[PDB]
TrEMBL record, chain A:
Gene Ontology molecular function: inositol 1,4,5 trisphosphate binding; store-operated calcium channel activity
Keyword rRNA-binding: no
Native source species: Chlamydomonas reinhardtii
InterPro entries reported in the protein's UniProt record: Ankyrin_rpt (IPR002110), Ankyrin_rpt-contain_sf (IPR036770), Ion_trans_dom (IPR005821), TRPC_channel (IPR002153)
Keyword line: Ion channel, Ion transport, Membrane, Transmembrane, Transmembrane helix, Transport
S-S bonds: C556-C566
Positions of transmembrane segments: 335-363, 390-411, 458-480, 486-509, 530-552, 581-604
Name of the protein: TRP-like ion channel
Subcellular location per the Swiss-Prot or TrEMBL entry: Membrane
Keyword Calcium recorded: no
TrEMBL record, chain C:
Stated name of the protein: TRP-like ion channel
Subcellular compartments: Membrane
Top-level lineage group: Eukaryota
Taxonomic lineage from the root: Eukaryota, Viridiplantae, Chlorophyta, core chlorophytes, Chlorophyceae
From TrEMBL, chain F:
Protein name: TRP-like ion channel
Organism domain of life: Eukaryota
Entry's localization field: Membrane
Taxonomic placement: Eukaryota, Viridiplantae, Chlorophyta, core chlorophytes, Chlorophyceae
TrEMBL record, chain H:
Entry protein name: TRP-like ion channel
Membrane-spanning residues: 9-32
Record localization: Membrane
Taxonomic source organism: Chlamydomonas reinhardtii (Chlamydomonas smithii)
Length: 734, 29, 35, 71, 150, 100, 21, 39
């Protein structure tokens, strides 16, 4: 009969009812692949436009069967098998990418089982391709959520050490591998005789005898991460670092944002289980035993929740500013006495800083003197205070924009030839040369990630590169060639470089808390909201500009022979034309109102999003800054260039004269032969007191999770416990 | 339902799956 | 095979030299500086 | 057979390729939907009851003392 | 989808080349040119494709996209521009209907270029500007334009 | 999933029941987060031979914003619509050149 | 606010007495 | 001729647009600071 009311609303509406090893690999014929390989022609016959072997079609079309035949039949060694799986595509995919590039659990579980057993020789899941993608980064990009978990369980298993023998680090290795062996549990091998499960040889070599399932039992849940954070700590690892590492595994997966928010809430719960500073720097410190620093990993992976805590902003402040000079602004005595000492000691800086850089490269009693300080760090040895190194940088920054705006307010139409070079116009070309040297050894030494995600390094290139290009193209446009329109490009390169300098000079407000989260906003509603609304307006404005030309074009018909009279009303008795241009320009003004209304509501969205995080972004941009200057030398970019020249000369001398001398002024900023803090690697009987004080903190953290995971085990059965206390009430029994 | 939700569930849905307390509310005052 | 996945990602990067007797308590970490 | 249809929007094929299982896929999907939605329906029975026990919390405590009144 | 969009950037380049490479001193074969009549065959075949996806996918689905209106209206305008230009060049040569012909090609050149923001529908960060401009013309404009008119 | 979408379409033409449409839209997104991988998402949305009731094509037909916006429902479309990854070649230095 | 956040522990103490006495 | 007054005016338009947008971004920041105190 007719269906239900639900019937005709939800039910499905419509009515329904070859010679190569490659095409025997993709279809999955085992024996046809075995016969034709006994004639052969290769085992890596690769087709042309995409560089796929006969292996990478089994990984493509989900045949673990004939990948397993080759591993049984046609292989000699470990080194021969890995040459087959690491045979890249034309994009660069190995065997493990192609099985994670598209959801093929049954092939991915074969490759992982070949990797748990140690039958490889390279980390097959850590290799990259042309785009730098990964096997874990392809499965997260495409979104195959069932091969992401299988890659999560492998990286959680591989964290735990196989060498230690503790009964709770061997239980949770058995309960991660058997989460994968029960995940396959079907899909037997190609031989119909000797049949065995996938993770046979891995659960065997683990030494643990265990003395209608739910989806709480076949997935990684929050009680499964807690079994790893304890067992990594019980086996000996930094518990603050295992939480940061397991977090950045789950941010890579993009589909476990309910577990990322828990692991973040444990690195903020462990971080304020501490009381003193002595307990903060006991769990954040590396030792000889675990050399793992978690502070340096958080500001490498931009960890805004850790890196702006009360206790992390306290261990940076007692190195950046141990004297409180940053609070000599909130008083009248502070501005007068702090300001007057600044213009004195910046006048004293610019006259002695060249004389120290020369007399430190070949005047060795000074280089052993300039290393003194830097553990006391305060006003006794003022060149090591990291706040003061920042103040000299901002003073040598405003000096460039005063000496550049004086270069343009002191131009005249008076003398062409002895004004192309000057004591001022050539001095700034050396200055901008030494900003470009500064950005090279910033880029080379840190890397492309922290360079582009920084303060104003991209902007400080362009104001330096366009002034040099102003300086060169003015020299060779007076003498080499005579004169052209090339002289008017010269006035644009100095107009960019004078604009970008004053907008660079609002980095003196990186530390203000009123003018600080206002510059970071105005950067962000200008590099996001305006460069994506200008692409929309360019399509609209080019449509009205075409439509005006179709509205003013002529059609000239009054002639008896050919082409004699022609009606003129172009701009791009006949009182009809102006009527149409008025109505057309009204439709453009309604369009301009409708887009100025969408631009202002676009920006008020961005104000609401960057100001709900005002004092977390600020305390993160501060601590990326307090860590950058604590490793940086006191030579600002105007004397960056003198330091490279005297150290290239002054260390070439002590290769001819005395040999194993050492202590050279190293030709890099951001010194590497310094742990960031002085409370790092604690040799002696301070190691024994940290390890006691760490184990007090972490053991009191791990049983406030074990309490808070017990209350959630009771929230799940709250309507079952209420029914049992109500019956244990004296209806039945007392 | 009082006998199926007597010890955890015999409706196979952890209880009788439409059964709670309603212990009983009073009027008073 | 000697590094782990945790090891490449989290440990201290560079190679340092162990000082002979370097304390880290609040005084006596500053004997070379104060004197 | 297989003549070019002049009608666009091919109505024979379903929307996705995983729509109608035919066999062991049908027996596995039934095991997966019972696994998922029986733990959807449990965690609504608990989460509705918690809002009943919030608003009516002093009446459960009063029923535990009312038994001193009767028995 | 990419061959749909690459055949759609091609339509507004040939249409905006037509209004720029328009020579006024040209005889009556300026009406029936090769390029002027190929664009009229194109917009003929757009109108037959909208009647197919009006009968197949229905009416509530058809008037729920917002681009199916602009596929009709720039096709119906240029195919009416192609007719009335022919009539106003050898049959009745007056400026009353000539200025309608230059008015349809202006209307049909806007809706070509408003149709080319459709490549940004899949892009994040320009996709939500096609939707906050569409919903603004659905919900808001037809209640504020009735008060600006008063 | 079909009954939750059907009971929500009932109460949205009733127009005076907004504390119940808010609860049935919150249960439609709570069902779709109990689902953990793609294998379970396409096992509560698939029409079997027993009940041939698709809830995907009925959410397209009644213009459902809160279902089609979800991150597991945006995945069943882009698995089927892209299947090669050539959308993700436009986020690299060496891919915008060769892709164009 | 203490009995809200710790409500399943009061109910569990009323059943823990079946465990001891 | 000689493309000479065109090269400078395309920098006159970039400088004026990226400033007037930059002031409007800063005026939305003041409308939305006084809104939160008025309301
Ligand atoms: C021949 C020379 C002529 C030059 C003419 C100059 C005329 C004035 C133009 C001034 C604009 C110069 C460039 C913009 C300066 C600037 O705002 O800062 C420099 C950098 C900003 O880096 P950041 O670290 O400071 O700012 C953020 C912030 O740190 C986030 O936290 C990061 O996120 P993350 O940590 O996750 O990585 C961002 O990274 P991401 O990029 O991935 O989002 C980073 O960009 O600018 C750029 O990246 C360049 C990219 C395009 C920017 C837009 C240019 C502005 C112009 C747009 C309007 C044009 C309209 C034209 C109309 C005719
Ligand atoms: C005076 C008008 C000023 C308009 C300003 C236009 C500014 C253009 C900005 C760039 C355009 C990008 C965004 C446009 C995309 C778009 O789709 O256009 C919107 C549409 C709006 O309707 P809809 O299709 O979305 O149709 C809706 C929709 O389908 C809803 O979703 C349904 O509700 P539903 O969801 O329940 O199905 C509605 O039915 P209901 O009655 O129930 O509500 C239905 O009416 O507007 C337009 O297409 C026109 C916009 C550009 C105008 C171009 C034509 C003007 C040409 C005139 C030139 C003058 C020259 C004369 C002199 C020579
Ligand atoms: C290679 C050398 C290049 C030149 C670098 C010289 C230093 C320039 C760098 C920074 C100074 C400018 C910024 C100063 C800002 C305002 C100063 C201020 O606000 O001051 C605040 C505090 C007040 O101290 P407090 O009571 O809070 O605790 C301190 C007592 N304690 C130490 C026992 C804990 O700190 C102090 O005054 C101490 C700070 C006073 C020092 C600044 C004036 C010094 C003038 C010239 C020095 C030039 C030396 C040249 C030697 C060549 C190499 C041999
Ligand atoms: C001028 C001499 C004054 C004495 C010199 C030494 C003074 C110095 O160099 O500090 C820099 C100053 C810091 O910001 P500033 O003093 O204006 O005030 C900040 C802000 O006002 C908040 O009160 C604090 O935020 P929070 O509520 O606590 O979170 C923040 O403390 P913290 O959060 O940072 O702890 C305060 O620092 O920024 C400048 O104004 C530019 C000064 C000129 C720089 C350019 C120099 C040429
Ligand atoms: C040359 C193009 C070749 C490849 C075609 C590529 C086809 C295509 O769709 O790209 C459109 C392109 C780039 O935008 P695009 O689609 O790549 O936008 C990204 C894409 O949607 C990803 O899938 C998103 O990740 P996810 O899904 O949420 O996980 C990502 O968000 P996020 O998470 O990363 O932040 C988005 O940013 O936009 C144009 O400029 C129009 C050019 C259209 C060309 C029209 C024909 C000329």
């Amino acid at each position: 009969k007719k269906p239900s009311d639900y019937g005709c609303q939800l039910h499905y509406k419509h009515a329904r009812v070859k010679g190569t090893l490659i095409t025997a690999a993709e279809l999955g014929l085992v024996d046809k692949y075995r016969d034709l390989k006994r004639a052969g022609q290769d085992i890596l016959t690769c087709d042309w436009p995409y560089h796929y072997s006969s292996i990478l079609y089994a990984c493509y079309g989900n045949q673990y069967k004939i990948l397993q035949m080759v591993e049984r039949e046609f292989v000699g060694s470990t080194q021969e098998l890995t040459a087959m799986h690491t045979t890249r595509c034309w994009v660069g995919k190995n065997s493990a990418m192609v099985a994670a590039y598209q959801g093929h659990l049954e092939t991915m579980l074969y490759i992982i089982d070949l990797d748990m057993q140690g039958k490889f020789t390279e980390d097959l899941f850590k290799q990259r391709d042309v785009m730098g993608k990964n096997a874990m980064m392809w499965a997260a990009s495409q979104g195959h959520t069932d091969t992401i978990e299988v890659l999560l369980v492998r990286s959680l298993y591989r964290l735990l050490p196989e060498d230690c023998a503790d009964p709770l680090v061997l239980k949770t290795r058995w309960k991660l591998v058997s989460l994968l062996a029960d995940l396959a549990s079907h899909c037997r091998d190609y031989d119909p005789g000797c049949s065995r499960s996938f993770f046979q040889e891995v659960l065997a070599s683990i030494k643990y005898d265990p003395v209608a399932v739910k989806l709480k039992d076949v997935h990684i849940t929050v009680r499964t991460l807690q079994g790893v954070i304890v067992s990594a700590y019980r086996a000996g690892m930094n518990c603050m670092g295992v939480i940061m590492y397991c977090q950045s595994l789950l941010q890579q997966a993009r589909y476990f944002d309910d577990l990322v928010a828990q692991l973040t809430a444990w690195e903020v719960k462990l971080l304020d289980t501490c009381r003193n500073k002595q307990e903060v720097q006991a769990i954040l410190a590396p030792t000889e035993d675990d050399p793992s620093e978690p502070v340096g990993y958080a500001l490498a992976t931009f960890d805004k929740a850790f890196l702006s805590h009360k206790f992390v902003q306290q261990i940076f402040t007692e190195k950046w500013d141990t004297m409180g000079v940053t609070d000599y602004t909130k008083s009248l005595f502070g501005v007068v006495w702090g300001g007057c000492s600044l213009v004195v000691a910046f006048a004293a800086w610019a006259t002695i800083c060249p004389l120290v850089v020369v007399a430190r490269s070949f005047l060795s009693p000074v280089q052993d003197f300039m290393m003194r300080g830097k553990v006391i760090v305060d006003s006794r040895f003022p060149w090591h205070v990291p706040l003061y190194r920042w103040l000299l940088t901002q003073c040598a920054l405003i000096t460039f924009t005063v000496l550049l705006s004086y270069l343009v307010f002191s131009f005249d139409p008076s003398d062409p030839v002895p004004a192309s070079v000057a004591p001022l116009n050539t001095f700034l070309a050396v200055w901008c040369a030494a900003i470009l040297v500064d950005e090279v050894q910033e880029y080379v030494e840190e890397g492309r990630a922290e360079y582009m995600s920084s303060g104003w390094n991209v902007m400080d290139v362009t104001m330096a590169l366009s002034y040099i290009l102003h300086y060169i193209l003015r020299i060779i446009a007076v003498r080499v060639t005579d004169n052209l329109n090339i002289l008017l490009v010269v006035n644009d390169l100095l107009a960019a470089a004078a604009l970008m300098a004053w907008f660079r000079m609002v980095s003196v407000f990186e530390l203000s808390s009123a003018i600080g989260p206002l510059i970071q906003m105005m950067k962000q509603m200008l590099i996001k909201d305006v460069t994506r609304f200008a692409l929309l307006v360019l399509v609209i404005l080019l449509g009205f500009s075409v439509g005006m030309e179709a509205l003013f074009q002529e059609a000239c018909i009054e002639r008896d022979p050919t082409t004699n009279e022609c009606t003129k009303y172009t701009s791009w008795f006949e009182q009809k034309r102006v009527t149409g241009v008025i109505f057309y320009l009204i439709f453009a003004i309604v369009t301009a109102i409708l887009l100025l209304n969408l631009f202002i509501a676009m920006l008020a969205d961005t104000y609401t999003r960057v100001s709900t995080q005002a004092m977390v972004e600020f305390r993160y941009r501060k601590a990326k800054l307090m860590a950058s200057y604590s490793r940086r030398d006191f030579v600002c970019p105007p004397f960056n260039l003198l330091h490279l020249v005297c150290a290239a000369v002054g260390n070439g001398l002590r290769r001819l004269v005395w040999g194993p001398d050492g202590f050279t002024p190293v030709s890099m900023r951001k010194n590497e032969t310094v742990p960031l803090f002085s409370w790092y690697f604690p040799q002696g009987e301070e190691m024994r007191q940290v390890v006691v004080l760490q184990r007090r903190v972490v053991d009191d953290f791990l049983n406030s999770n074990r309490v808070a995971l017990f209350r959630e085990k009771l929230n799940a059965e709250l309507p079952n416990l209420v029914h049992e206390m109500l019956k244990q009430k004296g209806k039945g029994d007392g | 339902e009082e006998a199926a939700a007597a010890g955890g569930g015999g409706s196979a849905r952890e209880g009788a799956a439409l059964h709670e307390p309603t212990w009983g509310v009073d009027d008073g005052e | 095979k000697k590094p782990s996945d945790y090891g490449c990602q989290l440990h201290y990067k560079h190679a340092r030299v162990v000082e002979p007797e370097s304390t880290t308590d609040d005084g006596m970490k500053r004997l070379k500086d104060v004197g």
